[PDB]
Amino acid sequence: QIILDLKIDPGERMDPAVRMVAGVVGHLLFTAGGRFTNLTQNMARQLDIA
Amino acid sequence: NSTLIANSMHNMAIGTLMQREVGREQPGVLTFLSEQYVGDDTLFYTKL
RNA sequence: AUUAAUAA
RNA sequence: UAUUAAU
């Protein structure tokens, strides 16, 4: 009933290590197929790239 | 003992909020290339 | 008062 | 310490 996407903010400034670690965390925190999903397809693509 | 350093870091915080607010209110108008803080004095090198 | 730059 | 530049 609720799915997530990625927020883009030009004012945000962060270490790239945060994004690379979130890449690992997202695969262990979310479900993306089978019977239901918590993510959009673009969000899964971004997590895969991370 | 730490007057100048604290003054300059407070000025840095003010400049950070300045940049964030001008980016929010008028996107794509000003790009910031340099920021300098030496106390109560602030300098910016930007492109308009 | 506080940091520097020369002189001693 | 002496002078000066700055804060």
Automatic annotation (TrEMBL), chain A:
Superkingdom assignment: Viruses
Subcellular location: Virion
TM regions (residue ranges): none
The protein's name in its UniProt record: VP3
Organism (species): Bluetongue virus 1 (BTV 1)
UniProtKB/TrEMBL annotation, chain B:
Record family assignment: Belongs to the reoviridae RNA-directed RNA polymerase family.
Protein's name according to its UniProt entry: RNA-directed RNA polymerase
Organism of this sequence: Bluetongue virus 1 (BTV 1)
